[PDB]
Structure 1
Amino acid sequence: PVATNGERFPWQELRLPSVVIPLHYDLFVHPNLTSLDFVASEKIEVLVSNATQFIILHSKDLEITNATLQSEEYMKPGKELKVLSYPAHEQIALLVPEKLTPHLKYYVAMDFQAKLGDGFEGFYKSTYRTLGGETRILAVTDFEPTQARMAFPCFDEPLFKANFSIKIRRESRHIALSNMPKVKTIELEGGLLEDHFETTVKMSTYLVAYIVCDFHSLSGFTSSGVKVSIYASPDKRNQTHYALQASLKLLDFYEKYFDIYYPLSKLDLIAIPDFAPGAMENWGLITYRETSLLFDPKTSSASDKLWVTRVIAHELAHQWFGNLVTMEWWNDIWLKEGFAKYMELIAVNATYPELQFDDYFLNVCFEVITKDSLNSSRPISKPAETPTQIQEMFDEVSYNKGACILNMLKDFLGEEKFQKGIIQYLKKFSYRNAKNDDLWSSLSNSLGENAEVKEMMTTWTLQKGIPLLVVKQDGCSLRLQQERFLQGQERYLWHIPLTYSTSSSNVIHRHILKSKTDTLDLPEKTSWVKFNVDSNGYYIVHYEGHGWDQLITQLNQNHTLLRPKDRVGLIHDVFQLVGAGRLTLDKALDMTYYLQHETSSPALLEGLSYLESFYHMMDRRNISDISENLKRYLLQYFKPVIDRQSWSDKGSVWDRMLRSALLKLACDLNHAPCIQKAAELFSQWMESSGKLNIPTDVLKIVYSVGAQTTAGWNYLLEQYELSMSSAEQNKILYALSTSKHQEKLLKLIELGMEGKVIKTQNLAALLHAIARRPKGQQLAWDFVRENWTHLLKKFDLGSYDIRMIISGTTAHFSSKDKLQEVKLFFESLEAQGSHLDIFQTVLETITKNIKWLEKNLPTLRTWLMVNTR
């Protein structure tokens, strides 16, 4: 079957035929930034394997005005082809008047043209405010995973790699960047210019990139030669200094660690005004949101720095993981993304150990654990089809779990061995693709008895959920039962490595596992044991017997006798099992007593995080009695440390993080003093007409405070537009979402639609923010529900944007009622809407909420009332 206008389609599967193999693209693009469109011409050197009468490749909203196939041997320049367009598979078929012949190299060549894109996809238009207040346009690309086909027709699968020779034509007011460095620039008749770029190494289509803009740069050189350059609005070249330092340090590290030089002469990182993802790893031309790449010590904070450091790291890691060695297909996307999410950890701890990213990392896992503890979860490695499924593939599973199980795996195998493991892997696939299994093999092979590692990871990657490992203590024999962990199954088995210490020697007893059930003996009767040291393992431990109580009392006596990640980890599981139903809320709440002794901010903050979480539940629902005693228990306890915090920016990262943490908790809870001081700094800053410097750490706090008066709110929105700091704007906007006036917030949400004052790219994040506040949880839900039509014009489902606009506004619900209006909306979404897996997840989550409450709510009230006495 087929289309468009009559005539039939030679190929009826959404994948492409292996027959016609692409070897090289010649790619010319003539964009116009006034006309706001482009004209283009390409020339693909094919290579048939089996003779055939028709050629098949991808194309999308591309008008093709000339199709030929020249011969190199058959025929002299050059026969014309018949173009068949099948949209519902975003394919076009070429028609030859003469079947081709195996083992022969041809040249398919077409002329095409389109308008510059609307969205955040393909070859699209973006703008930005100068310091003068001028709006300015530029042209940029985003091809992952299925969008190179909207830019130039091609074989848009990650497996069909090729060389790419791009030529860009431009006004003299602009510059052109692309993956490779610029060979030359010729002038043209009318004073037009044409840039020629080094031919790329073999590489997938989704990684091709080109850009026209009038940006400025800071350049530098990695010790191994490469010219790193940070590109941004000319008014912003200052914020690009950190980006440069770190890129440099990082590329240096990577080359050494991976023991593979980065192939290209140059590496550019550019800060795109309008950019949907946080960044795109385009080889030699990595795009970023300004908030991922730009840093301004006046406005950028502890966390900020850490995060931009983080995404720069993550993106440079891609130059190897993904770029050099590309997964064969979007099912094992995780291979690219989990390994990159992981290498984050390594390289930053490596180069910037002061950022102390390690103590953080776990959160990456804790958070995936939250989503993996549902039935609506999935296997890191899964079948993928429609472009939409592919997009759905980009999530916490592929990213975080992937990064976590790898980390676990590195524990079982050790750095030096794991490092070797990857060096090999990379080199064995340089400039090509690799399969899920391919990786395991290259790792597990780093006598004469065998590293069976495969089995282990193979269960991890290919099935849902996360293991719960209950342990029973009877003198010197410990019962081990492994279950699928869920949050209130049958058929899951994990080769889950175990770890554990005892109250005795602080030494790490290891021991694998691969059966539904096993047992182990303890060399000496001991107080307590703690399985999964440092929490380096992707699983949970439940302590039946006095196992739980023993650990908790240990925490109140001499807690330092516990690893600070054990502490952290413990806190985590305790509260999770309370949701599992296996524990009762009082036990967890009781752990939170030792927190007055806890100096590991990691733990101190995690504990606090949960207490904080409960107050917020109570607050949304009207539950005034609990939320107010919780506020009180929070102010009173912790008032020691709360009152120890300086409205400054001194101390280590965690010291700063802790400061902002607490001081927020304080102002959020209305601690008169703090909320007065904050009030002060703002009125000062505002009336000093911006001259006064609020410390970046308390920055959000002050802004969010000053936003309570319509006087301040109106100054901040005014202040927002003029700002040159992506980072400051972020914080202003946040502070804007802390108003209590419906229309005020409503305004924001609408300005997000508009997308002229507040870029649409923020629409999700913003919505999410408002839905959080009790005031706006309704507004938001209303809006999304009402505007799902126009929303879907602006974004794709399932774009991460749409995906999070959905959950962000609903995932926090906890009533039977809300759970229907959602359930119902998801039914409604069921023309073009249905279906996103997030539809399930969202519900599974709202049920878990109602449950957790009806289950554990009464327990909360008494537990608190108890303290009051």
Structure 2
Amino acid sequence: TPFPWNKIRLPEYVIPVHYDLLIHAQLTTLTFWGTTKVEITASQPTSTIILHSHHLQISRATLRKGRLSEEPLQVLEHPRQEQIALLAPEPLLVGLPYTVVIHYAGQLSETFHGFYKSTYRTKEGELRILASTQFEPTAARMAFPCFDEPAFKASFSIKIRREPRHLAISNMPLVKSVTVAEGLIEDHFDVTVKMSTYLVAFIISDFESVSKITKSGVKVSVYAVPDKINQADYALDAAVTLLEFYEDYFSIPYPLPKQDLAAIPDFQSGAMENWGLTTYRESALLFDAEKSSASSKLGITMTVAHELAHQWFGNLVTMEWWNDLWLNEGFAKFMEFVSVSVTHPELKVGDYFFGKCFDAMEVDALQSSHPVSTPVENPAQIREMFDDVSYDKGACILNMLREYLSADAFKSGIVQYLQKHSYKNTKNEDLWDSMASIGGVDVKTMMNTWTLQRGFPLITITVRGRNVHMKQEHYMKGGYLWHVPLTFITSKSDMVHRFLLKTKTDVLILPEEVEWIKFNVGMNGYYIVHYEDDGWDSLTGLLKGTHTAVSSNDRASLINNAFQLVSIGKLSIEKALDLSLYLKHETEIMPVFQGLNELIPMYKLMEKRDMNEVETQFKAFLIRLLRDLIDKQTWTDEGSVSERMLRSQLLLLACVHNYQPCVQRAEGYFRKWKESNGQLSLPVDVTLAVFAVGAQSTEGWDFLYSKYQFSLSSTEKSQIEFALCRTQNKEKLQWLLDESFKGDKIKTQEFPQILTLIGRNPVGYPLAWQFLRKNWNKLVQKFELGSSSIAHMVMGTTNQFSTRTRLEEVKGFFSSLKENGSQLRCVQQTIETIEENIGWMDKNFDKIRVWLQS
């Protein structure tokens, strides 16, 4: 019998309203069984129900009407479309309720998606097995058969059968636990509100918990393994504050009685926003006040803010289809900064936002970047939407739109959009309609330019007395027109002046002549700026003579833009390097980090070429440039989060480049720490430098690795992994890859990061690209084609190559995969990146060699 449906998308005429899911997982055999009952209605007469199912063995399917009548359903499967077809003996009557009942079995996934196995070892040595879920985007169909597309919203009543030794949690509160046959307990959770299948969640584990109630009465809890629940308090307090913030900000209460935050021992992404049961990597939630870094504290706060923003932007209101995933992700990413700027003002997170926009511009400058909203169909293409364009470009265009409309008008537009579309699905046009309903400024033409075209513009400024000429063109490495909300300040006015450039060119007249003008104030706009004539000389002079004339983020924007303009031949590498010399007097984290972001990649290219002399001189130039700031750092955990992050990065950079004052200090801490058998608490902020130096000897590497198995600190485990990956012993590098790939000694959730760190090691970088090619199939099976993890592995191991032989290795390898990876967007991105690295190094290597000598 041929399969009666030939489309990836399900039919539109059979709609679910409610699911009753009974799941029994047997954690000793890793088998699970389920009974799914789905209440549906048909709007057309049909005798066939198509729905999703992947890797489930269906034993029986029946159609109930009512007066109960049952009819057996015949089951057909189309595994490539991940669909099943259920055939009824007579047509369903239009508009009447029916209930499809499906009994099935499956095996817990050994990946990080679907209903999957997670393990950990107690401090006492016992291996413990738990089961958890990760469904977004298309894996709910691996746990229960369903209409697995986000616009088929429905309510869900979940029942879990489990051994008495385990705890089960799910989206909603536990309302009853009933003893059933064969020594099991069946937990019944309350019915969810109407929501997408990808948000269903359930966990069977040994977790402990802590809780706190919001002012609105919502019970917030953190769940973690017993040995780590003592690290839950920071996240619990942050979650209560952030949930209260969003309820007030949006004027829409959180609608469930409780919100859980569960730290899972094995987790692929950072976290997931399942309604009522948000999940996290342990590193993204758990804070050890003695060993966690300042960056970790900031990251937990932002991750909790992101998952809680999604309760409104993603859960309450959901994109209709994955082409518009940015409506969920760009908003959640932007709301991290809107919220944490108010809830945790000590973190000064608004100061860091622009860096996310420069992350998006790296990808979006390439010829094959995709528009923010773009068509996708199959699961791998949908997973590719979880990328820096949806998250970071999405947040950056919303920031630009909020600055343009004003925070109050943008907030009113948010609130109207969330209220109007509550418990429903949206597309881009709904957001523009809401934003314009405030009848306010129409946003559709402008925002279509930022969502339906790839890339961003270069704005060129030419000043002739009071006349300021503006032009826009597409910025691309290797037709476009936007509505660009420009901003500028000048030597005579630090008010933010606004000008909307909707055309190829325009002109404005300053009230009086100025000494300099600086566009894109605060880097709040998604564009870059070039200045003709003496413009770059004037801004270089401003940075050299009176750098505080513009904000720290404005100085970071000039550093980034100057180097981006070298790439397209608008500014010479010598002039961009001359501008970077001002950094000898820079004190602030954002412009220092932007200088590292532009200069460090240049030596990473040199490390993989026959360029020892220039590589050495370039690294010496970088340390000389920042030497005074490096020397001023204390070897402590003092200061604000920015002061701490700046210290840690600078000491690590200095030690990696063998700056003897820092190496000697790091060697002394490592020796004292090792001689004390690790008793001695080191300042967290110097730990990366200390461990990186210590792991350079065989005794130090072995000692550091010996402490890894006992650590309960996600920061300490991360710092040890980083340091071990800096070894120049290739047998130890291969061991790190083999062992993290296997997941026993080092968990596989760390393998993507370890592979990129080894891909960036100056001696062992070939091993990482080699490992990726040899183990590709298993890596795809574990992490999935199209995943952000596979994208980071492909870029991480290849995007610092700069020869035509390496470019052909990448093209030849990936083209040979055919359906198993040749068409990945990350592969085209890394090819275009290597093509740019080849051209940039051919054009600029000798110029840099001469500049360093002069």
Is the TM value for this pair above 0.5? yes
Counterpart secondary structure, 2:354: helix
Residue number in structure 1 paired with 2:441? 451
User: Superposed, which structure 2 residues align to 1:618-657 within 5 Å?
Assistant: 618-657=606-645
The answer as to whether partners of 1:142 and 1:209 remain within 8 angstroms in 2 is yes
Cα distance in 1 between the residues matched to 2:622 and 2:475: 31
The answer as to whether partners of 2:605 and 2:801 remain within 8 angstroms in 1 is no
Residue number in structure 1 paired with 2:279? 287
1:829 positional shift: 1.9
Residue number in structure 2 paired with 1:101? 93
1:189 positional shift: 4.2
Question: Does residue 1:56 correspond to 2:28, yes or no?
Answer: no
Question: Does residue 1:842 correspond to 2:834, yes or no?
Answer: no
The Cα RMSD (Å) is 1.3
Cα distance in 2 between the residues matched to 1:218 and 1:740: 44
Cα distance in 2 between the residues matched to 1:513 and 1:614: 34
Q: How many residues align?
A: 854
Cα distance in 2 between the residues matched to 1:373 and 1:189: 61
Question: Does residue 1:505 correspond to 2:475, yes or no?
Answer: no
2:431 equivalent among 423, 427, 439: 439
Question: Does residue 1:215 correspond to 2:215, yes or no?
Answer: no
2:540 equivalent among 552, 555, 564: 552
Of 324-333 and 784-793, the range deviating more from structure 2: 784-793
Counterpart secondary structure, 1:183: strand
Residue number in structure 2 paired with 1:35? 29
Cα distance in 2 between the residues matched to 1:794 and 1:594: 47
Counterpart secondary structure, 1:211: strand
Q: TM-score, normalised by structure 2?
A: 0.98
Cα distance in 2 between the residues matched to 1:380 and 1:608: 28
Cα distance in 1 between the residues matched to 2:568 and 2:121: 50
Counterpart secondary structure, 1:261: coil
1:639 positional shift: 2.2
Cα distance in 2 between the residues matched to 1:604 and 1:815: 30
Cα distance in 2 between the residues matched to 1:548 and 1:719: 52
> Which consecutive unaligned segments of at least 5 residues does structure 2 have?
none
Question: Does residue 1:833 correspond to 2:821, yes or no?
Answer: yes
The answer as to whether partners of 2:115 and 2:142 remain within 8 angstroms in 1 is yes
1:110 positional shift: 1.1
Residue number in structure 2 paired with 1:476? 466
CA deviations 1:837-856 (Å, max 9, x no partner) are 11111111001101111111
Residue number in structure 2 paired with 1:12? 6
2:161 equivalent among 169, 181, 187: 169
1:432 positional shift: 1.1
CA deviations 1:570-623 (Å, max 9, x no partner) are 111011101121100111111122223322221123224433333333333242
Letter matched to residue 510 of structure 1:
R
Relative to 1, partners in 2 of residues 1:457 and 1:142: Cα closer, same or farther, differing over 3 Å?
same
Cα distance in 1 between the residues matched to 2:43 and 2:167: 40
User: Superposed, which structure 2 residues align to 1:565-714 within 5 Å?
Assistant: 565-714=553-702
Cα distance in 1 between the residues matched to 2:107 and 2:771: 31
User: Superposed, which structure 2 residues align to 1:847-866 within 5 Å?
Assistant: 847-866=835-854
Residue number in structure 2 paired with 1:382? 374
1:519 equivalent among 487, 504, 507: 507
Residue number in structure 1 paired with 2:20? 26
Residue number in structure 1 paired with 2:338? 346
Cα distance in 1 between the residues matched to 2:518 and 2:566: 18
Cα distance in 2 between the residues matched to 1:381 and 1:177: 35
Counterpart secondary structure, 1:27: strand
Letter matched to residue 446 of structure 2:
M
Cα distance in 1 between the residues matched to 2:499 and 2:199: 43
Of 214-223 and 675-684, the range deviating more from structure 2: 675-684
Question: Does residue 1:769 correspond to 2:757, yes or no?
Answer: yes
User: Superposed, which structure 2 residues align to 1:352-371 within 5 Å?
Assistant: 352-371=344-363
The answer as to whether partners of 2:112 and 2:782 remain within 8 angstroms in 1 is no
Residue number in structure 2 paired with 1:4? none
Cα distance in 2 between the residues matched to 1:182 and 1:743: 51
Residue number in structure 2 paired with 1:324? 316
The answer as to whether partners of 1:823 and 1:843 remain within 8 angstroms in 2 is yes
Cα distance in 1 between the residues matched to 2:99 and 2:457: 54
The answer as to whether partners of 1:620 and 1:773 remain within 8 angstroms in 2 is no
CA deviations 1:1-57 (Å, max 9, x no partner) are xxxxxx122211111111111000011011111121111101111011111111111
Counterpart secondary structure, 2:177: strand
Residue number in structure 2 paired with 1:397? 389
Counterpart secondary structure, 1:421: helix
Cα distance in 1 between the residues matched to 2:624 and 2:529: 32
Cα distance in 2 between the residues matched to 1:788 and 1:594: 45
CA deviations 1:673-706 (Å, max 9, x no partner) are 2112111211221221120011111111111111
Letter matched to residue 699 of structure 1:
T
Residue number in structure 2 paired with 1:194? 186
Question: Does residue 1:85 correspond to 2:73, yes or no?
Answer: no
The answer as to whether partners of 1:592 and 1:607 remain within 8 angstroms in 2 is yes
Cα distance in 1 between the residues matched to 2:727 and 2:541: 43
Letter matched to residue 362 of structure 1:
F
1:186 positional shift: 1.5
1:764 positional shift: 1.1
Residue number in structure 2 paired with 1:66? 60
Cα distance in 2 between the residues matched to 1:226 and 1:821: 55
Residue number in structure 2 paired with 1:3? none
1:479 positional shift: 2.0
Cα distance in 2 between the residues matched to 1:684 and 1:115: 50
1:110 equivalent among 89, 92, 102: 102
The answer as to whether partners of 2:386 and 2:787 remain within 8 angstroms in 1 is no
Q: TM-score, normalised by structure 1?
A: 0.97
1:831 positional shift: 4.2
Letter matched to residue 553 of structure 2:
K
Counterpart secondary structure, 1:186: strand
Question: Does residue 1:262 correspond to 2:254, yes or no?
Answer: yes
Letter matched to residue 633 of structure 2:
Q
Cα distance in 2 between the residues matched to 1:599 and 1:84: 66
Residue number in structure 2 paired with 1:140? 132
Letter matched to residue 327 of structure 1:
M
1:326 positional shift: 0.7
Counterpart secondary structure, 2:59: strand
CA deviations 1:623-671 (Å, max 9, x no partner) are 2222222232233333222111111100111111111121112101101
Letter matched to residue 564 of structure 1:
S
1:710 positional shift: 0.7
Counterpart secondary structure, 2:329: helix
CA deviations 1:729-783 (Å, max 9, x no partner) are 1111111100001111000000022111111121111100000011121111111
Residue number in structure 1 paired with 2:766? 778
> Which consecutive unaligned segments of at least 5 residues does structure 1 have?
1-6
Counterpart secondary structure, 2:41: coil
Counterpart secondary structure, 2:345: coil
The answer as to whether partners of 2:587 and 2:629 remain within 8 angstroms in 1 is no
Cα distance in 1 between the residues matched to 2:773 and 2:38: 46
Cα distance in 2 between the residues matched to 1:638 and 1:755: 39
Cα distance in 2 between the residues matched to 1:121 and 1:543: 49
Letter matched to residue 53 of structure 2:
S
User: Superposed, which structure 2 residues align to 1:297-312 within 5 Å?
Assistant: 297-312=289-304
Cα distance in 2 between the residues matched to 1:636 and 1:104: 77
Cα distance in 1 between the residues matched to 2:851 and 2:218: 61
Question: Does residue 1:406 correspond to 2:398, yes or no?
Answer: yes
Question: Does residue 1:739 correspond to 2:731, yes or no?
Answer: no
1:234 positional shift: 0.4
Counterpart secondary structure, 1:643: helix
Question: Does residue 1:430 correspond to 2:422, yes or no?
Answer: yes
Letter matched to residue 18 of structure 2:
H
The answer as to whether partners of 1:281 and 1:287 remain within 8 angstroms in 2 is yes
